Design a protein around this ligand. Sequence first.
Ligand SMILES: NC(=O)c1ccc[n+]([C@@H]2O[C@H](COP(=O)([O-])OP(=O)(O)OC[C@H]3O[C@@H](n4cnc5c(N)ncnc54)[C@H](O)[C@@H]3O)[C@@H](O)[C@H]2O)c1
Ligand SMILES: NC(=O)c1ccc[n+]([C@@H]2O[C@H](COP(=O)([O-])OP(=O)(O)OC[C@H]3O[C@@H](n4cnc5c(N)ncnc54)[C@H](O)[C@@H]3O)[C@@H](O)[C@H]2O)c1
Ligand SMILES: Cn1nc2cc(N3CCOc4cc(C(=O)N5CCC(F)(F)CC5)ccc43)ccn2c1=O
Ligand SMILES: Cn1nc2cc(N3CCOc4cc(C(=O)N5CCC(F)(F)CC5)ccc43)ccn2c1=O
Lengths: 255, 255
Amino acid sequence: HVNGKVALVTGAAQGIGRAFAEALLLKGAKVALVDWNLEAGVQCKAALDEQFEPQKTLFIQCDVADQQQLRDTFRKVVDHFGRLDILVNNAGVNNEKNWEKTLQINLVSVISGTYLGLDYMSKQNGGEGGIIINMSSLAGLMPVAQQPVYCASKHGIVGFTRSAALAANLMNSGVRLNAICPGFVNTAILESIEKEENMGQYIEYKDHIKDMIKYYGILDPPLIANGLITLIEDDALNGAIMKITTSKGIHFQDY
Amino acid sequence: HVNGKVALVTGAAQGIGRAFAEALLLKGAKVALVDWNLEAGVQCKAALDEQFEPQKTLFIQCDVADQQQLRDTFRKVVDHFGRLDILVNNAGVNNEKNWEKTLQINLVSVISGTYLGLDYMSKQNGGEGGIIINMSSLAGLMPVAQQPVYCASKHGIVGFTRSAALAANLMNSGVRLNAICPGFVNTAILESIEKEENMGQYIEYKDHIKDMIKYYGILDPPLIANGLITLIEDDALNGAIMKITTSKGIHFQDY
Ligand SMILES: NC(=O)c1ccc[n+]([C@@H]2O[C@H](COP(=O)([O-])OP(=O)(O)OC[C@H]3O[C@@H](n4cnc5c(N)ncnc54)[C@H](O)[C@@H]3O)[C@@H](O)[C@H]2O)c1
Ligand SMILES: NC(=O)c1ccc[n+]([C@@H]2O[C@H](COP(=O)([O-])OP(=O)(O)OC[C@H]3O[C@@H](n4cnc5c(N)ncnc54)[C@H](O)[C@@H]3O)[C@@H](O)[C@H]2O)c1
Ligand SMILES: Cn1nc2cc(N3CCOc4cc(C(=O)N5CCC(F)(F)CC5)ccc43)ccn2c1=O
Ligand SMILES: Cn1nc2cc(N3CCOc4cc(C(=O)N5CCC(F)(F)CC5)ccc43)ccn2c1=O
């Protein structure tokens, strides 16, 4: 189901997004790597081009929270690769200080990107259907005392995705929407909990998170990519909230 | 436990917010009615003045989604009444068409209002503690096919409020933060499901909501206000997610 498909992955320069790009590439997708960090993107594209044919990937610099630029980016992806099959709204930040920007990136941009994915992929517009995967977190399901707004953002993604999936069935768009909710993942974002710039008033309680990181353990990005691929290959999965934890592996929130 | 306390209720001009204001007035609070609807707000305070003493209420016109107005409105309330004890972040809209505004109103404003509430009320800032109640919805706990962004916003409030409650404990702020998640309530917002202006692309699916309304029935605003009073009066309730249904009345989400 993945071979020959065109995926747009936001936040693809590193971490989970990069892992998605690699997993999709390994299974024969073409991937637009979309990220606001041009330097990390360049390095990512360089590394991918050592493992994959260059025609298989495209780097586009975009701040997903800039809606005009996001729209431009979708236009570029479809102009470059001719179609869109898979959208992964993966970009996210931890910033409890500039918390409005956290909401803009983590939630608003997931909704706007989702809506663009439906415009490009819905059968209602003559598309072939497709899949949209949105990156939530266990923080989308349970509280995080040291990051309430991050928590808010990931909760929003759960409710939004479950609802949009239901609406997709009703509209016969042919688009399946699912969300992934990882435990801690071994990526650079974990570093953010050390910085008053990112934690603001919550910086003083950062060691509680550091303890949870060690006691729950951390997930390898490839494992999340495995979850991604599962979602993409199983066309029964719509509205699914996929949980990935070190203890229970890849499973689902039941409602 | 309520007598002589100062309450700020957003969305106070009508609906659940008006019910909160009345319930609080009945229990001896002073209430700042904050709402963007000048006409409704003026008539609300006029109606309240016929039943309660005029000095117990202050109407302030404010778009809560305008953070500068919100901040200013907080300053005017505390200047007028001399302190803040109870913040009810109750304003919300249903608008899946200009869904960015819906997030600004339903989620951004709840967080910014909460943060303002804590600025005044936290012990660590020279406050004497108090309570913040956020208005979620059952849409904060489950999907709504015909209003995905409303759902996202209400989910956001649940994640935010449970998280901030835990933080308030860590920080010994002396503030309790709870959320209420009603089923359908007999207010003017129910009319919006009939309008393309509010429903946008989901307008064609509104009958499903209408069917749920007939299925579940409709709650009276005063019952919701009874839920508010329960939260204010019980100092053991922090991070509680109160559900109010026709079937079960006032109860709590168990996690
Ligand atoms: N790592 C974890 O523990 C964890 C757990 C649960 C969920 N998540 C979520 O997984 C997703 C991926 O994060 P990660 O762990 O790989 O972190 P990361 O910080 O290493 O990678 C995030 C990537 O997104 C990009 N990005 C951020 N804001 C952007 C914007 N406005 N426009 C474009 N690109 C932007 C960054 O430049 C970066 O390349 C995020 O949504 C994060 O919230 C992470
Ligand atoms: N009525 C329901 O079935 C139901 C169910 C669950 C939750 N809720 C929530 O209850 C709350 C109260 O809504 P309601 O049912 O009383 O509806 P309503 O439309 O009758 O009242 C909402 C009030 O909020 C005000 N408001 C809206 N946006 C504002 C803004 N930007 N700035 C200032 N004031 C603003 C409106 O002017 C109005 O007076 C909302 O948060 C709503 O989402 C309602
Ligand atoms: C059984 N079990 N339960 C849990 C609960 C987990 N939590 C609760 C605390 O905060 C979290 C944050 C994020 C999160 O998205 N992060 C980490 C902090 C950040 F880097 F800033 C942003 C990205 C994910 C999960 C959790 C984790 C593993 N867990 C597990 O294995
Ligand atoms: C057991 N049980 N389960 C449920 C589920 C309910 N739902 C799911 C569908 O949508 C909702 C919307 C709102 C909501 O906040 N609204 C209504 C629509 C609006 F006017 F536009 C905005 C404000 C509230 C609840 C529900 C309702 C009662 N329920 C019950 O009693």
